């Protein structure tokens, strides 16, 4: 029953804590937590390749894409492993995250342990924006806050 | 051929970047980088068990100890896996770290990916301080900076 945690920090007001849980080996991963400081609405929410914060969110690299696919939403079969879609902030500025995903894992080749959770500036278009950036980043924009995903108890 | 990296931050002056490189699987890990903000002399330098930064360096737990052993130095047979000994800060408060270890790994059960690098306040006594603290922490004192260890390019 693996568990992970991620503390999200950026250059601005956006901060939060994301929990990860996988009760079965290679079974679904439950992703839940809270992010505050956001503008109201949808924000891209992706696992990026590298858990490298040496240069802020920038050195986390691209959406985690071990199987070399195009960008999609969580419910797409065309997607990066790291494609978790959007999270929704209320007028509050808080996004209560609750996601369940079978593509990310906390063990093996698709493990996101040691990688980076990034919350983005803009709504993720889920690869339907009809341009090359869409199939890359979802047009999700800049990286507002991130942290390395670590093993939790 | 694995690489990892860690940005150490804390509440005070201490901060650094620590790189890990394992050329061969199950082979030596090279841990190198620099930390500034330190008082001159030797400072405990250990891998702690959890990549949990939710309450600062505290939530990192104890030294990484998969084999349930007592605190030792890196050269000792009786050591924790995360027991990397001391690092040395020069007069300018800068510690050039260059360690080669064979017990920590970047994969398998002794993998330090997703765990926490902590630099400590005081010198690590290597488990020989003659008390309980010694056999736990090396009497290395408080956690001055830390970061989660993540996959690097
Ligand atoms: Zn993507
Ligand atoms: Zn120890």
Curated annotation (Swiss-Prot), chains A, B:
Impact upon substituting residue 6 to S: No palmitoylation, reduced nuclear targeting
Major place of residence: cytoplasm
Post-translational modification as stated in the protein's UniProt record: The ditryptophan cross-link at Trp-32 is responsible for the non-disulfide-linked homodimerization. Such modification might only occur in extreme conditions and additional experimental evidence is required.
Keyword field: Acetylation, Amyotrophic lateral sclerosis, Antioxidant, Copper, Cytoplasm, Disease variant, Disulfide bond, Lipoprotein, Metal-binding, Neurodegeneration, Nucleus, Oxidoreductase, Palmitate, Phosphoprotein, Ubl conjugation, Zinc
Cofactors named for this entry: Cu cation; Zn(2+)
Impact after mutating residue 43 to R: In ALS1; reduces structural stability and enzyme activity; increases tendency to form fibrillar aggregates
DNA-binding as UniProt keyword: no
Signal peptide residue numbers: none
Effect of residue 16 to S: In ALS1; sporadic young onset
Localization, UniProt: Cytoplasm; Nucleus
Catalytic reaction annotation: 2 superoxide + 2 H(+) = H2O2 + O2
Residues with N-acetylalanine modification: 1
Resulting phenotype, residue 45 to C: In ALS1; slow progression
Residues involved in Cu cation binding: 46, 48, 63
GO annotation terms (biological process): action potential initiation; anterograde axonal transport; apoptotic process; auditory receptor cell stereocilium organization; cellular response to ATP; cellular response to cadmium ion; cellular response to potassium ion; determination of adult lifespan
GO terms under cellular component: axon cytoplasm; cytoplasm; cytoplasmic vesicle; cytosol; dendrite cytoplasm; dense core granule; extracellular exosome; extracellular region
Lipid attachment site numbers (S-palmitoyl cysteine): 6
Residues where Zn(2+) binds: 63, 71, 80
MF (Gene Ontology): copper ion binding; identical protein binding; protein homodimerization activity; protein phosphatase 2B binding; protein-folding chaperone binding; small GTPase binding; superoxide dismutase activity; zinc ion binding
Residues in cross-link 1-(tryptophan-3-yl)-tryptophan (Trp-Trp) (interchain with W-33): 32
Family membership noted in the UniProt record: Belongs to the Cu-Zn superoxide dismutase family.
Subunit structure: Homodimer; non-disulfide-linked. Homodimerization may take place via the ditryptophan cross-link at Trp-32. Heterodimer with SOD1. The heterodimer CCS:SOD1 interacts with SLC31A1; this heterotrimer is Cu(1+)-mediated and its maintenance is regulated through SOD1 activation. Interacts with DAOA; the interaction is direct.
Extra information: The protein (both wild-type and ALS1 variants) has a tendency to form fibrillar aggregates in the absence of the intramolecular disulfide bond or of bound zinc ions. These aggregates may have cytotoxic effects. Zinc binding promotes dimerization and stabilizes the native form.
Role according to the record: Destroys radicals which are normally produced within the cells and which are toxic to biological systems.
Disease implicated: Amyotrophic lateral sclerosis 1: A neurodegenerative disorder affecting upper motor neurons in the brain and lower motor neurons in the brain stem and spinal cord, resulting in fatal paralysis. Sensory abnormalities are absent. The pathologic hallmarks of the disease include pallor of the corticospinal tract due to loss of motor neurons, presence of ubiquitin-positive inclusions within surviving motor neurons, and deposition of pathologic aggregates. The etiology of amyotrophic lateral sclerosis is likely to be multifactorial, involving both genetic and environmental factors.
UniProt protein name: Superoxide dismutase [Cu-Zn]
Gene behind this protein: SOD1
Parent-record interval covered: 2 to 81 of 154
């Amino acid at each position: 029953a693996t568990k992970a945690v991620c503390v999200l920090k950026g250059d601005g007001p956006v901060q939060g804590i994301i929990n990860f849980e996988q009760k079965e080996s290679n079974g679904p991963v439950k992703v839940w937590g809270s992010i505050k400081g956001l503008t109201e609405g949808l924000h891209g929410f992706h696992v990026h390749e590298f858990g490298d914060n040496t240069a802020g969110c920038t050195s986390a690299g691209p959406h985690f894409n071990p199987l070399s696919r195009k960008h999609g939403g969580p419910k797409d079969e065309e997607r990066h492993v790291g494609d978790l879609g959007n999270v929704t902030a209320g007028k509050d500025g808080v996004a209560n995250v609750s996601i369940e995903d079978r593509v990310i894992s906390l063990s093996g080749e698709h493990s996101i342990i040691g990688r980076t959770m990034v919350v983005h500036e803009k709504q993720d278009d889920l690869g339907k924006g009809g341009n090359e950036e869409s199939t890359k980043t979802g047009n999700a924009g800049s990286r507002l806050a991130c942290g390395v995903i670590g093993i939790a108890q």
